[PDB]
């Protein structure tokens, strides 16, 4: 979780 690279996405697609 936490560490997530959000250059071209906002978050995971799973919810």
């Amino acid at each position, epitope marked *: *979780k936490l560490g*997530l*690279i959000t*250059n*071209t*996405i*906002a978050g*995971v*697609a*799973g919810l």
Partner: antibody
Amino acid sequence: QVQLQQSGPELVKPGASVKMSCKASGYTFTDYVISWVKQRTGQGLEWIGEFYPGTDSTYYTENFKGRATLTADKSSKTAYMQLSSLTSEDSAVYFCATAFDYWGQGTTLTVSS
Amino acid sequence: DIVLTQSPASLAVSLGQRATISCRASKSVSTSGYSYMHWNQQKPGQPPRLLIYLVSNLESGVPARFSGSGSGTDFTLNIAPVEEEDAATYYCQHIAELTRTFGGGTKLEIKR
């Protein structure tokens, strides 16, 4: 630096299934969502879904809801996409990308009898 | 799904000219925070490469030659000026809404 090693070209017959691979290099595997995009030769780009190694969270688009199966082995920092019940219309190039930031060379899939 | 319409389908240009590609959203592509409109650059036989993310942000490695603008549902890729290695097919793409979708693409070609 981010690097995506995708399995070689795949030749299989209709009704079968394939498990394509994508080996991530240069980054902490759990930081990047793995995106799966389809491009039918000469056509545009189609998002299939994604596997997030951080929480194994996944998303499937309606057209791959039953067929596809996204997975990953944190051990070898590799992510797989499995497509089942293949048809001639599944014949395309399949990219895996670190959340649209970087894209592998892709895997050309040729379904035929 | 949210439809991203991209024009022109083909853009004839001359080496040196500037180039404006357009991408229009079906709905406002702003999430609670940023706007996830992205421009990709794909050449024959190769995978696409990221040029611009979040509307205006230059991906690492891409030259100041490329520029991104727009807001809400109207976005523009700006190449000033055009080079040999720029000649190819350009895609836009949204990530605000979901499912995530791409534009039909634009073919950047030489005028003669």
